[PDB]
Structure formats: C-alpha cells, structure tokens
Chain A
Amino acid sequence: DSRDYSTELSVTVAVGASLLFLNILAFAALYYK
C-alpha cells in the first residue's frame, strides 16, 4: 500500500480552513457595528 498520508493531511486542512473562515466571518458580522 502507498503508506503516504499527504492526501489525508491535505483534505483535513481544507475542512479546517473552511470552518475557521466561517468563524472569522461570524466575527466580521458581530464586530461590524
């Protein structure tokens, strides 16, 4: 088997960045007076 985990680390980062981006968008909503 290809014992490489680059692909899985890659996908894990995309989902994490999406969640963090949505959270910073929530901050953009609230902090905007």
Chain B
Amino acid sequence: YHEHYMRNSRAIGVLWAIFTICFAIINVVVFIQPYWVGDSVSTPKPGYFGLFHYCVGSGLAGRELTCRGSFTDFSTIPSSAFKAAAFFVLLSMVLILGCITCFSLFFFCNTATVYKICAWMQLLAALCLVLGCMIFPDGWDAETIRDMCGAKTGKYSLGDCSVRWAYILAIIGILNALILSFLAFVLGNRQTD
C-alpha cells in the first residue's frame, strides 16, 4: 500500500508542477499579449487593447494600426484602473515565477513545507489576478477606450466592443490558480500522512 501511496504522491506532484508551469505561461501570455478587448462590426473604429498596450486603426478602410503603450512608462497607460490591473497581473506573474523558482527547494527543504509555500504563493497570485481582472473594466471610461468603442461604453460596461481571448484566458488562469493552490495544499498535507 505504501509504495502505491508514494508513487501516486510523486506522480501527482510532478503533474502539479507541470500545470504550474503551464499557468505561468498563461500568465505571461495574458500579461504581454494585448487582446483583452477588441472591436466588433458595430464598433465605430477598429483595434484592440490589453492591460497597458493599445492599437487603434486610423479609420480609412484599412488597418494602419497605430500602437501605443508600455508598462515601463506609466504615463502612456490610459487610466489609473489600467495601471492598477497591469501592476496586479505583473505581481501575480512574479509570484508564480517565484514558485517555479521555489521548486528548487525540494532537494533540501521538507516536501510539505515547500508544498505549503507554493500553495500560499499560488493563492496570492490568484488573488492578485482576481483583483486585476476586476479592476481592469473600471478603466473603460478612459477617453481612448471610449473613442474606440463609442459613447455607450463606460465603467464596467462592455458596450459595442467584445472581449477577446486574453480576457477569458485570464479568467481561466484565475480558476487554474485557485485549483492549483488547493491542489498544493492537499499535496502538502498528504506528504505528512
């Protein structure tokens, strides 16, 4: 019985780490790729935008997507809500990367202790991602986003635009972070036996 116990624990820990790396990739992708919201057929003017970066069409029956925005320079971010959301998503990415670094502690530190460490860090990353996703719609009142989507757009109001893959992928990342955190807690309590 004990050998099966240890084998299942080891394998499930390996899968947990694999999915942790996958969630870190997801967090990096959503943080970088600017496809959180996008135009629609009824939108006055095309483009897309993410946490900080935004590309907007010139509006002459072509693309000419002029692009502007960078987390390094906070001046060009449209709104304070966007700045807060970008900072929270960055903090979540740093936290999950810290857990992937803390995987190195398995040589020396006790397995339960490091499992609880990454459990808490993944939970904190999930909380940060939740706050980022809840705060990001608050900045839709910005003049750039309103000029893009239209006058009907507003605070926590999608309007004419449509959410693109990055937003739903961030929500999926939130769910993944919660389940991975609980998984890490259960594994840490399970190694103790």
Interface residues of A (CB under 8 A from B): 3-5, 8-9, 11-13, 15-16, 19-20, 22-24, 26-27, 29-31
Contacts and interface: CB of A to CB of B under 8 A. Distances in A.
Interface of B: 8, 12, 15-16, 19, 22, 38-41, 43, 46, 162-165, 168-169, 172, 175-176, 179-180, 182-183, 186-187, 190
Contacts of B40: 3
Contacts of A30: 8, 12, 183, 186-187, 190
A26 B16 contact: yes
Contacts of B41: 3-4
Nearest to A11: B165
A31 B190 CA distance: 10
A9 B176 contact: no
Contacts of B165: 5, 8-9, 11-12
